[PDB]
Design an enzyme around this catalytic site. Structure first.
Site, mmCIF file in Angstrom:
data_model
loop_
_atom_site.group_PDB
_atom_site.id
_atom_site.type_symbol
_atom_site.label_atom_id
_atom_site.label_comp_id
_atom_site.label_asym_id
_atom_site.label_seq_id
_atom_site.Cartn_x
_atom_site.Cartn_y
_atom_site.Cartn_z
ATOM 1 N N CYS A 60 29.037 95.594 -65.065
ATOM 2 C CA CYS A 60 28.162 95.137 -66.135
ATOM 3 C C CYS A 60 27.433 96.307 -66.807
ATOM 4 C CB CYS A 60 27.157 94.125 -65.602
ATOM 5 S SG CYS A 60 25.956 94.818 -64.435
ATOM 6 N N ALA A 63 25.199 98.381 -64.622
ATOM 7 C CA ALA A 63 25.914 99.383 -63.853
ATOM 8 C C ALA A 63 26.089 100.642 -64.699
ATOM 9 C CB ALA A 63 27.261 98.847 -63.352
ATOM 10 N N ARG A 94 26.757 105.285 -55.286
ATOM 11 C CA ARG A 94 27.428 106.272 -56.099
ATOM 12 C C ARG A 94 26.925 107.649 -55.691
ATOM 13 N NH1 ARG A 94 26.498 108.086 -61.806
ATOM 14 N NH2 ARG A 94 28.440 108.381 -62.922
ATOM 15 N N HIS A 193 26.691 102.450 -71.028
ATOM 16 C CA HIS A 193 26.714 103.850 -71.419
ATOM 17 C C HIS A 193 26.030 104.033 -72.776
ATOM 18 C CE1 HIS A 193 30.811 104.484 -69.140
ATOM 19 N NE2 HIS A 193 29.810 104.255 -68.285
#
Ligand code: ICS
Ligand code: ICS
Ligand SMILES: [Mg+2]
Ligand SMILES: [Mg+2]
Lengths: 478, 522, 522, 478
Positions: A60, A63, A94, A193
């Site tokens: 999503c 994320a 991560r 992003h």
């Protein structure tokens, strides 16, 4: 070992499983590479909504914002704003490495959340958010600033986090960045992003515009390296051996100050195009800073990348690039002599996010391996354009692959190795197919740079040639 | 740089001088890092009673929680049913995380689908998502059942699951008799365990509510067992084993132990074992229903009491000696089966171990956290061992639970220094283990960071972590363990004693300084 | 002094300043201790290749051995027979030690008698000791069988056991028909494992040699299982479990698992379970005999082949994947029983674990020691896991065994850096882990001292011990583990990978120095 | 509580099990205390051969020499001379604590052995022994000397270890002590003590007879404290707080130098009478050094012992003894207040070696506990003489108790706690009877001195009142 025609027949057979609507859609997202194509015709459809119920690998917008772009910034506090789930599942999953004293001046592996309860849904979370910022200033006084990473409910209940942030930033004298990365937005990590790049543009990047800075001709920033297992550090070292000065890393091991100084650099070096082309483009528009794409996977691409970067400067940097490449040649030749004979001729299928499905091909080829299938969770057409030249002829291509599709393709193509994520790993191991995580590096790496390549080769060999793979069949069932 | 015959990964590669120098320049040149002295001073301050005061005055911020969200529990519950696909109505980001979280704990595939509600659905709702999603899921992955739960998006916008599923059937997306039980699982109520309860009660209602007319309590001569949210394979197995040994007829309602442990034999099996639909349909005919984790099975209990008419026994989680004894004696009473020689001997072997190890365990001080039932079972067993559970933290605990734990503590002398905390997190716990230091922590992998913090103060302040709970991500195959029954008690005892002895060996390994007490025999 | 609310034991009491001062005065005033610098310099020198050279040139001195003496093994063997008292003809000091050694490993009573031969018997021999001893033992402890072995005194003096026992019977000290099997167990031949072989063959002879006339191979449709010297309860249990799951009729010949694990239920049980005399009497009627630890069952094998006429299969110890597979396939062949789905699934679960853990295991370097069969099984499994067993020590190993192990190593790439040592001790091994440092040691509690030595050179040189073998005295209840079968392989795998991860956490726990690689997820 | 008559009837019942010969013998080793008894007539037989086949708890002369007296000497190397068993079983099984760098200047937890093979039986081991001493000198050059601890075979094969030793000592310039402690000698550990004390007399003690030493009027040696869990250190400290100077400790944490300087002391303080009265009497004969027996178990005995030792010196030391006793009284009072109420009225049975069966009674009584049975493995009549005054009236007494006897006695007397060794521990635990090791201190201690007593009280309470003891009966069998 398979013709274009067979691959195309494979695609048609796999699509038989779907209802008509799903089938019609999925047919657009599966292709076979052919570089004898009109380079203006799209090879594949991309960056569309996932079909319901088909088990996409995709995440999503939260994320892509919190997990990917913002989370790594080590000296700010990132609040997961909403109910408790999103921050918990994304807590330290991560490997965006950093150096710090966590809980004191860095905060990367911590989970700050507003842990929404029902009363926060009904009455709104703005007042809660304001108090949270106070509590953070009390308890974490060395934080350089705060981000607010919105989860699904914030948008849906009409909270006004921009207002809270503006007032709080004025009071505390530090950036408080509201990010509208709610997970119902967009189709994937990709839009996160973009939202995150714009939040940086709009709330951080221009703060030092007036200010003087001690600059040099050789100042660069590494844009779009999240330092997975130290990837950015093993990149940085080469750039400094070459005589450049890395003012900032976005956002692996990155700091607020580094971001804020980035408008002073002479060149933006873009590794992950997908995630940070947006801010790279902005910085060229507003500040006239050029950006270039590069690739630090494997000796072929590193050499190409160093020479290309050096040619943007002057003769001395170019000389230096030749020195750096020569220094590491003995190492690279030793790594190839050791491992290439154990990997020669082996076939690989990849499936990753937005960059590595194309970027790592050169490194596999430096070990004599061939990528016979690749794909992306959330790439755009511009990524697929860049993939064509990197790919072999008649290579299978898959955009937002479904669970079902990836399994069927693997059963037919029978690769020697698969490179994908955690949700895929344990499926293919049960099938007896060597698997390497190409996000997390399977808790290894770095893979970027010359030091990275030695680890990459060791790991591919370790897994592909491991004894465990000869043992899956009980001897009394042969 | 690298020696090719001895390749270094991140550790210890970045300890090479050249990298150290480069990173020292990065910090000094570019990071505008606080001075070390100041970092030291602030660190010190985070270890104090003063800081703890401010920390416990938090009303709005949560740091390092020790709980997850409802649908995570709904998924695990669903995985325990034969050929059942977990289906989460709402946003797909959620399902990516749920899958990863379980993948990392179990080192197994974890199958779950979303219907990928997007901005399009944020005003109009997810009806079309449900229609296409059910149809796509059924055709693509061929489950016999789809068990529907929700993400927070769908809860906020208020999608009516019942209507959407009924409309999916009426309009031919899935067959009318295809099983689609459902539950609202809001992430902003309770926690993951609540989600399991909600999902389970949903499935129970689906197969029993409309067919109660023909049911007769006791008619099938079995005991139902509802396990709750359980992430140890051994726990499902030990319950089955003990009942089988007693010759007790039983139905384990939600049994994922097969599908969370398929063999690597060349074939991927998306589905394996699980509770049958027949078992759920027949469950009202049992003698009774036993709930293994009653503190998160309250809704289930109301359903089982109100509709099935089962007189659910008041049993704690069967952890430790007393509570395992009570579980077996109750199952004996309900079933008429005597407790057999084998279980009697197993019990005596546990007691033997307790006598053999008591001297090392006596007075040891523990901080601990987890889910309510797990935590209270661990507390109980620690008291049975003569250990002191000083800091007892349950983020998702409530006042009724805290009172029940406070009474358990008050019935033992080893309870005198204990406090129970509810609604507190692991940043709270961090303060407690600095200001009132225990010998060890018992919890999940998130505790590792507390252990690091304590070591930074100094070796004499370090509080080692002992990994028991969920999730465990930084060790391999602990998911195969047991924490229930005599078998679980033996494994917990062994883990505790040997953690103690391991740490004692570390402290006495200094040649000519501390190794006077580095004894061969303990 | 002491604070009464926080009482200190030796550690850390003697770290108090007053004690430090007093002991600094003791050393300086009265001990004439070498100066620290010189101790440092000599220590350093003990870590060198030069010292290792001198060390390996020893021809007469043994330091820190890794074996025991025959009668230890005779006692363990005897303990495995129903209502059997172990009886060691010779000096009593021996029996005190044998009992203590096993008490400390198993944390259980260990029943054994001596006949307390003294100087008086040193010339005339122990005939009277045998007469009175047998009679006293039988009346006092009411065994149904007394299994006689010897201490080195009796061996040196040359007592004829056969004659002494037969004379004990002829003169009415014990009944003629009371079973008194015996074996010479000289401590200056072989080791503890040899003692087990000798005792076992003695008991087999006692009940079968004179009664061969009526025996027919295969007539009882069973397989005999001889376990050898085995100090893991799980190993006896896993063999029984696997054979029962296959529906294979079997006799375990020497089975102490009950008497080494009695319940603590209010009563002391001197005797429990064990192989019946009827089982040993009927053993020649089996289809065949399987020897689980063939490298110390050579005499047994010659007896079973020469008198019973059994064609003992050529099987390695069933450790690891291949050798467990081969054991099961051979048992299948002999019995006609197919390998069932349960064992097939168990195998694939092991292989799943191997695939899940291979990245951490790959290339890890191990020093290891133990008894011949155990060592070679551990070697084999390490190769199956992609680990490198660099230093392989078997103090009580022989040339034929070393050659078999060298061939196992030569068939794998992971064997390239391995050397097998026989007749070498733990002071030898100490030099190897300094000069050619591995990642870990796998061995018994005696290894702890090597770990201490390595840490003293510095943290970067420390070689952690992983406790697998015998004896284990400084941890509790590891005697309950398993090392055979798929179950044993799973537990070994888990121990190995988690030792690796534990040590990696230790090395990456340094705040801001190494914790960049202190990952939550591994 | 049982009458003398009942106890005597218990003895008669238990003896019924034995054949006549055994019965007649064992009847002499079991008694009921009667302090209004005879002056000269023994109450019990002791230090006789064990009966065959009856499961004595006793060990051998090697245990009493190597295990007990010699093994603790930290800076010498002790060779277990014979086959491999004895040294391995005795390796680090006794917690005779020391300070050193093991493998370099100390050797206590190591096992040095000649590991006899058949060749060594047949041809003798003298040549092997000579080479061993060479190899020791090469590999452990900081050793102050060597002992040779004979196992059963040495005597029986006619090896001449005295000759090997005298030649080797001349060559290497250090004591090499041959000890004829072969296990067939004597009846028990006891004779090993004697042999060992004589080996010290004959090969070590006189080396510094000619030499000067810087002496003071307050120089003492602690004789017969083996520093179990630091017992000697927590004793030593009190003696120094009192103003004395402890020149040597025999043999806990002890050294060759300390032994060799012991002839220069003013007073030998004998704790373990049994094991070291021999050398104490030799030292009074040859050097005129007096010896006195003392007891450091529990506050009553410590005070008695300090005052008694002080009165051998002068008024200053006596004043000092009163200071030391007063300083620790608040501690002792705090320990008694905490733990005496939890132990008041509880009954204990003991069985140990040669000292503790009487020596610890005072400490138990300081906690309100009563010893209702006690006995020794290998005491002599002089030890039983010393036990009578320490014992309550009509207390059961047992010398070289058999496994059978001890079990029957425990079943009848039903003690609340048992204090014995490792071979007994797990028997009585199964019966539901709290058990504390009174050799090894159950890996706890020290128990000597004021600091020792606090640990003793904690441990008795820890075990006697432990929750585990309430749980042995399954609830469905009540
Ligand atoms: S940011 Fe992106 S999915 Fe460019 S969201 Fe994803 S640390 Fe992938 S292919 Mo995880 S566009 Fe980075 C990525 Fe690539 S998290 Fe990492 S591996 S190079
Ligand atoms: S030496 Fe004796 S058996 Fe006096 S051989 Fe034995 S460390 Fe015992 S009762 Mo173990 S005469 Fe010491 C003894 Fe007492 S080994 Fe220790 S506890 S006070
Ligand atoms: Mg797995
Ligand atoms: Mg036990």
């Amino acid at each position: 070992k398979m013709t274009r025609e067979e691959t195309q027949a494979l695609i048609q057979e796999v699509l038989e499983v779907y209802p008509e609507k799903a089938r019609k859609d999925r047919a657009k997202h599966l292709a076979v590479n052919d570089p004898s194509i009109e380079q203006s015709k799209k090879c594949i459809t991309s960056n569309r909504k996932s079909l319901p119920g088909v088990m996409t690998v995709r995440g999503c917008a939260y994320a892509g914002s919190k997990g990917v772009v913002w989370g790594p910034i080590k000296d700010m506090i990132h609040i997961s704003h909403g109910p408790v789930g999103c921050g918990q599942y994304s807590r330290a999953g991560r490997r965006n490495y950093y150096t710090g004293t966590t809980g004191v001046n860095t905060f990367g592996t911590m989970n700050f959340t507003s842990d929404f309860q029902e009363k926060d849904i009904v009455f709104g979370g703005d007042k809660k958010l304001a108090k949270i910022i106070d509590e953070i200033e009390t308890l974490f006084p060395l934080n350089k600033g705060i981000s607010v990473q919105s989860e699904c409910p914030i948008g849906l209940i009409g909270d006004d986090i921009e207002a809270v942030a503006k007032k709080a930033s004025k009071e505390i004298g530090k950036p408080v960045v509201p990010v509208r990365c709610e997970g119902f937005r967009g189709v994937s990590q990709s839009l996160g992003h973009h939202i995150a790049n714009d939040a940086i543009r709009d709330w951080v990047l221009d703060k030092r515009d007036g200010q003087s800075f001690e600059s040099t001709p050789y100042d660069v920033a590494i844009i779009g390296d999240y330092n997975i297992g130290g990837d950015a550090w093993s990149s940085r070292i080469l750039l400094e051996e070459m005589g450049l000065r890395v003012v900032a890393q976005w956002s692996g091991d990155g700091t607020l100050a580094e971001m804020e100084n980035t408008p002073k650099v002479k060149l933006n070096l873009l590794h992950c195009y997908r995630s940070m082309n947006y801010i790279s483009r902005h910085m060229e528009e507003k500040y006239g800073i050029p950006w270039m794409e590069y690739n630090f996977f494997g000796p072929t691409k590193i050499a190409e990348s160093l020479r290309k970067i050096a040619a943007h400067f002057d003769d001395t940097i170019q000389e230096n690039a030749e020195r750096v490449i020569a220094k590491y040649q003995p190492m690279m030749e030793a790594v190839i002599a050791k491992y290439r004979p154990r990997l020669e001729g082996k076939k690989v299928m990849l499936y990753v996010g937005g960059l590595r499905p194309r970027h790592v091909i050169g490194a596999y080829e430096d070990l004599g391996m061939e990528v016979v299938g690749t794909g992306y969770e959330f790439a755009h057409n511009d990524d697929y354009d860049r993939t064509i030249k990197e790919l072999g002829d008649a290579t299978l291509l898959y955009d937002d692959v479904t669970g079902y599709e990836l399994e069927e393709f693997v059963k037919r193509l029978k690769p020697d190795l698969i490179g994908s994520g955690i949700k895929e790993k344990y499926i293919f191991q049960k099938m007896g197919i060597p698997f390497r995580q190409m996000h997390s590096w399977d808790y290894s790496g770095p893979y970027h740079g010359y030091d990275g390549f030695a680890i990459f080769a060791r790991d591919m060999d370790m897994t592909l040639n491991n004894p465990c793979w000869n043992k899956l069949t009980p001897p009394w069932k042969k | 740089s690298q020696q090719v015959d001895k390749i270094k990964a991140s550790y210890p590669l970045f300890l090479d001088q050249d990298y150290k120098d480069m990173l020292a320049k990065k910090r000094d040149g570019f990071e505008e890092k606080y001075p070390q002295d100041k970092i030291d001073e602030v660190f010190q301050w985070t270890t104090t009673k003063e800081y703890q005061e401010l920390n416990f005055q938090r009303e709005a911020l949560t740091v390092n929680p020790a709980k997850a969200c409802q649908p995570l529990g709904a998924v695990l519950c669903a995985l325990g049913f034969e050929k059942t696909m977990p289906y989460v109505h709402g946003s797909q980001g959620c399902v990516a995380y749920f899958r990863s979280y379980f993948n990392r704990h179990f080192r197994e595939p974890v199958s779950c689908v979303s219907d990928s509600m997007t901005e399009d659905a944020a005003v109009f709702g997810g009806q079309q998502n449900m229609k296409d999603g059910l149809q796509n899921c059924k055709a693509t992955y061929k489950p016999d059942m789809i068990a529907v739960s929700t993400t927070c998006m769908a809860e906020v916008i208020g999608d009516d699951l019942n209507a959407f599923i009924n409309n999916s059937k009426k309009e031919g997306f899935i067959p009318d008799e295809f099983p689609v039980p459902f539950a609202h699982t809001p992430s902003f109520v309770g926690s993951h365990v609540t989600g399991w309860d909600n999902m389970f009660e949903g499935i129970a209602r689906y197969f029993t509510l409309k067919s109660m007319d023909d049911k007769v309590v006791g008619s099938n001569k079995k005991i139902n067992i509802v396990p709750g949210f359980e992430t140890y394979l051994g726990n499902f197995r030990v319950i089955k084993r003990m009942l089988s040994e007693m010759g007790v007829g039983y139905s384990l309602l939600s049994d994922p132990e097969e599908v969370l442990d398929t063999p690597a034999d060349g074939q991927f099996r998306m589905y394996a074992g699980g509770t049958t639909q027949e078992e759920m349909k027949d469950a009202p005919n049992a003698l009774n229903t036993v709930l293994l984790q009653p503190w998160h099975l309250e809704k289930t209990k109301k359903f089982v009491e109100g509709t099935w008419k089962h007189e659910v026994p008041k049993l704690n989680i069967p952890m430790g000696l007393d509570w395992t004894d009570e579980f077996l004696m109750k199952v004996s009473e309900i079933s008429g089966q005597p407790i057999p020689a084998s279980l009697t001997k197993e019990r005596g072997r546990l007691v033997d171990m307790m006598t053999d190890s008591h001297t090392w365990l006596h007075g040891k001080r523990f901080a601990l956290w987890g889910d309510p039932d797990f935590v209270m079972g661990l507390v109980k067993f620690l008291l049975e061992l003569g250990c002191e559970p000083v800091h007892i933290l349950c983020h998702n605990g409530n006042k009724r639970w805290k009172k029940a734990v406070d009474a358990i503590l008050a019935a033992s002398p080893y309870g005198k220094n204990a406090t129970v905390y509810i609604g507190k997190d692991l940043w709270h716990l961090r303060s407690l283990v600095f200001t009132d230091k225990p010998d060890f922590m018992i919890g999940n992998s998130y505790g590792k960071f507390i252990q690091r913090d304590t070591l930074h103060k100094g070796k004499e302040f370090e509080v080692p972590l002992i990994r028991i709970g969920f999730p465990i991500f930084d060790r391999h195959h602990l998911h195969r363990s047991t924490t229930l029954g005599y078998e679980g008690a033996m494994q917990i005892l062994t883990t505790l004693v040997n953690s103690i002895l391991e740490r004692l060996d570390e402290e006495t390994r200094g040649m000519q300084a501390t190794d006077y007490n580095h004894d061969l025999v303990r």
